[PDB]
Amino acid sequence: RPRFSFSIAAREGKARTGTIEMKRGVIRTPAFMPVGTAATVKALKPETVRATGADIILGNTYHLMLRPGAERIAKLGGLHSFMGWDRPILTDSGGYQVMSLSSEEGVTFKMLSPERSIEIQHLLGSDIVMAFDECTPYPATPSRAASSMERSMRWAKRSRDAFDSRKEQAENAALFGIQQGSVFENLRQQSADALAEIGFDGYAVGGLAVGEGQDEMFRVLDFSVPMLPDDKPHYLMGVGKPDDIVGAVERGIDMFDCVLPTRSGRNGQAFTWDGPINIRNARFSEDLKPLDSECHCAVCQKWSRAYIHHLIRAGEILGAMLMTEHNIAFYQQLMQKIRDSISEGRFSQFAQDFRARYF
Amino acid sequence: RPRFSFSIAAREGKARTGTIEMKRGVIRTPAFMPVGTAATVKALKPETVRATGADIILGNTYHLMLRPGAERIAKLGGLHSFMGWDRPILTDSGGYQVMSLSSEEGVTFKMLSPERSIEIQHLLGSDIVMAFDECTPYPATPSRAASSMERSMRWAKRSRDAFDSRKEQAENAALFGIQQGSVFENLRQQSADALAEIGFDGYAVGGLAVGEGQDEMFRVLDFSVPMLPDDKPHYLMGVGKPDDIVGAVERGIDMFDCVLPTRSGRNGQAFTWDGPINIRNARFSEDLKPLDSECHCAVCQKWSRAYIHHLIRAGEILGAMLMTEHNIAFYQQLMQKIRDSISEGRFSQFAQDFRARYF
Numbered sequence: 053r054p055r056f057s058f059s060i061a062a063r064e065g066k067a068r069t070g071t072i073e074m075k076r077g078v079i080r081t082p083a084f085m086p087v088g089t090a091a092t093v094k095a096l097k098p099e100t101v102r103a104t105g106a107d108i109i110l111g112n113t114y115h116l117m118l119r120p121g122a123e124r125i126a127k128l129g130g131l132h133s134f135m136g137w138d139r140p141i142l143t144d145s146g147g148y149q150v151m152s153l154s155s156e157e158g159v160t161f162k163m164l165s166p167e168r169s170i171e172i173q174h175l176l177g178s179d180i181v182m183a184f185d186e187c188t189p190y191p192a193t194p195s196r197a198a199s200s201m202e203r204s205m206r207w208a209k210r211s212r213d214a215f216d217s218r219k220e221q222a223e224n225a226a227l228f229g230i231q232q233g234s235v236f237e238n239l240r241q242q243s244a245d246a247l248a249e250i251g252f253d254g255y256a257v258g259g260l261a262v263g264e265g266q267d268e269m270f271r272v273l274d275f276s277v278p279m280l281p282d283d284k285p286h287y288l289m290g291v292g293k294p295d296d297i298v299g300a301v302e303r304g305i306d307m308f309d310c311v312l313p314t315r316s317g318r319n320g321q322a323f324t325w326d327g328p329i330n331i332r333n334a335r336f337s338e339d340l341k342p343l344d345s346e347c348h349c350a351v352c353q354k355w356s357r358a359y360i361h362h363l364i365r366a367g368e369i370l371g372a373m374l375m376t377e378h379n380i381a382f383y384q385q386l387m388q389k390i391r392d393s394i395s396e397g398r399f400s401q402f403a404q405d406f407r408a409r410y411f
Numbered sequence: 412r413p414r415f416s417f418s419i420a421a422r423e424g425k426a427r428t429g430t431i432e433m434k435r436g437v438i439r440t441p442a443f444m445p446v447g448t449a450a451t452v453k454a455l456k457p458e459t460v461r462a463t464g465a466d467i468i469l470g471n472t473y474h475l476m477l478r479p480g481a482e483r484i485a486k487l488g489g490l491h492s493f494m495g496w497d498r499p500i501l502t503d504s505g506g507y508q509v510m511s512l513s514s515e516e517g518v519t520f521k522m523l524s525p526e527r528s529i530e531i532q533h534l535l536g537s538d539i540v541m542a543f544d545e546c547t548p549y550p551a552t553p554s555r556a557a558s559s560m561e562r563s564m565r566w567a568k569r570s571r572d573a574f575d576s577r578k579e580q581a582e583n584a585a586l587f588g589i590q591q592g593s594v595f596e597n598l599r600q601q602s603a604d605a606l607a608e609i610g611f612d613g614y615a616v617g618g619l620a621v622g623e624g625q626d627e628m629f630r631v632l633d634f635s636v637p638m639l640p641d642d643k644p645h646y647l648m649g650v651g652k653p654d655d656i657v658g659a660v661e662r663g664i665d666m667f668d669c670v671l672p673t674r675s676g677r678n679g680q681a682f683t684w685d686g687p688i689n690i691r692n693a694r695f696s697e698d699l700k701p702l703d704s705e706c707h708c709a710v711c712q713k714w715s716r717a718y719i720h721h722l723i724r725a726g727e728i729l730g731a732m733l734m735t736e737h738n739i740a741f742y743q744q745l746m747q748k749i750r751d752s753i754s755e756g757r758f759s760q761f762a763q764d765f766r767a768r769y770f
């Protein structure tokens with residue numbers, strides 16, 4: 053199979069649908085990547101993750117570089133082998149996580165640099181390597197975003213050279229650059245230009261899903277995404293409320309990752325086509341209906357709201373498992389519905405039908 | 412299928428192997444029943460519970476009578492439907508749980524009587540109904556056990572009559588009486604006699620796994636089990652360390668339930684043929700071996716100790732799932748190994764081979 057080959061099969065407006073062919077599998081785009089932060093998609097076996105329809109999962113160098121550690125994962129045969137997932141894994145570069153969770157050379161925390169970042173993701177056996185960037189604090193001044201963006205672009209080229217330096221990783225993996233510039237269009241252009249000049253396999257929009265709200269997020273996507281190379285995937289990092297995803301696809305985004313389905317799943321929130329439900333609610337205690345009346349997932353085929361209600365209220369691990377599986381399943385069905393409606397050129401109507409029922 | 416039919420296919424010493432045929436399935440004996448205390452076998456889907464090889468699961472009226480409640484489970488189509496398990500369920504009668512967890516008529520707690528107990532288990536749709544008894548506090552004086560046992564036998568006959576009173580339950584379910592008498596042989600005889608005079612489908616030994624230690628537990632089984640009707644299953648409630656099970660089978664016990672595989676599973680303990688391991692131990696951090704070198708379970712086929720180590724140390728739900736599944740799988744393999752070695756008449760050698768390696 054190819055190392056990295058992105059093919060757009062259909063379009064509608066700025067929305068695209070296609071595939072990314074990678075050595076470890078095909079990624080159907082627009083793609084939702086379940087997040088597997090500690091070398092697990094929480095409360096799901098990889099197989100279950102796969103059955104929900106995910107093509108690729110997201111991992112973080114920051115978390116794994118600490119536990120169990122990058123060299124150790126390498127010694128253990130790589131992340132894929134370690135967690136039992138043999139399909140593409142996208143590893144975040146460590147830039148956002150060192151921020152929220154914890155110089156020119158890089159970042160010291162309790163050192164992550166572009167070179168080490170790439171080296172770690174290589175150690176992990178990452179298929180898609182994220183340039184190591186400086187996630188832009190939001191809000192931030194024009195001047196601040198600018199300098200923060202430009203460090204990121206300098207780090208982008210360093211990322212590029214480190215990656216290109218490692219034959220094995222260059223041959224088998226993909227490197228995505230990350231656009232920064234905050235909400236500022238000219239900064240966003242500057243950054244897209246620098247990234248394009250360097251050249252990457254894919255272009256992420258970083259700096260969003262920073263509490264800017266959907267409106268301002270979409271506003272930025274509106275100008276930011278068309279500045280990226282059309283022929284490469286566009287990855288909106290960390291975005292995934294169902295309606296965020298729809299509106300970002302409408303704006304040219306092909307890839308998504310979000311802790312929302314999993315985490316909200318464990319907390320009682322079930323996504324349905326009629327909007328999320330909180331299954332803990334007493335109203336579900338004798339509700340024999342499945343979580344969602346349409347959902348094809350194993351959970352909706354087998355268990356009632358009443359049972360899951362019971363389960364979540366009792367803190368039962370099976371509650372978390374069922375909710376999470378349903379929710380990832382839901383997310384994947386939405387992506388599938390998005391892919392098919394784009395390839396059928398009715399994505400517009402989907403989005404409106406979706407929004408209409410969901411809200 | 413029959414309502415309740417116990418057939419002994421082979422014997423070795425006091426050990427028996429056979430089947431209990433019930434309307435909702437066959438129970439291979441000696442049987443280990445995973446415990447599903449809140450209408451779930453913790454961190455396992457029923458299907459997973461089934462794949463490990465369990466034929467029957469244990470439920471408690473005490474827990475379910477409170478949450479979600481017995482009438483409500485009934486309204487919801489029964490326990491089987493509710494939790495997605497369609498095979499026999501054995502419901503404990505509420506006698507031990509009102510004790511550890513919370514008159515002649517019954518017990519008031521913050522009222523459970525023989526009649527209500529049976530009515531609740533009928534509401535649950537229990538296949539095997541436990542007489543409602545007074546679990547004997549241990550230790551206890553001869554006089555005390557005696558009076559506590561005799562209330563239990565009076566409750567046993569009440570249990571019997573209530574059960575027999577409910578046509579539907581009498582037709583489709585089984586009623587097991589429970590022998591009491593503590594460590595006292597004559598009390599144990601008295602009780603077996605009263606139970607036999609009443610007549611039940613099966614005979615449980617209650618009052619053990621009360622911290623008496625394996626020695627004194629086996630000592631009591633030694634005289635207590637032969638007093639029960641040979642032609643009926645013998646159920647040792649709440650017993651299940653792997654070596655407890657082997658020694659109880661050697662003493663004529665056909666059925667077991669124990670929270671040990673599940674709970675110890677969630678806490679880091681993996682059973683192996685070379686004895687339990689605590690997977691949290693640093694020694695497993697780069698151990699690419701499966702939990703147990705022989706275990707056929709999905710977990711041992713797929714994941715390394717190092718990964719599960721990582722998982723459990725990080726408090727990852729998948730850690731609990733994998734450990735629990737392995738452990739129930741282990742327990743079922745032990746029961747299978749016990750069944751086959753009895754039917755092959757080499758159960759003696761198994762027990763010694765087992766004990767030899769395991770300790």
Ligand SMILES: Nc1nc2cc3[nH]c(NCc4cccc5ccccc45)nc3cc2c(=O)[nH]1
Nearest residue numbers: 145147148185187258259260261262289290311
């Ligand atoms: N390298 C890089 N990685 C990023 C990862 C991002 N993740 C997100 N959103 C995740 C998220 C999920 C759920 C709730 C959240 C609340 C506050 C902030 C983030 C939340 N944004 C990311 C941006 C970057 C980035 O710019 N660079």
Ligand SMILES: Nc1nc2cc3[nH]c(NCc4cccc5ccccc45)nc3cc2c(=O)[nH]1
Nearest residue numbers: 504506507544546617618619620621648649670
């Ligand atoms: N009706 C009835 N039910 C019983 C249930 C019993 N369960 C046990 N053992 C469970 C158990 C599992 C693990 C650790 C434990 C520690 C202390 C006490 C019990 C533990 N014994 C039971 C007896 C009865 C009974 O006599 N009657």
Ligand SMILES: [Zn+2]
Nearest residue numbers: 347349352378
């Ligand atoms: Zn579902």
Ligand SMILES: [Zn+2]
Nearest residue numbers: 706708711737
């Ligand atoms: Zn195993």
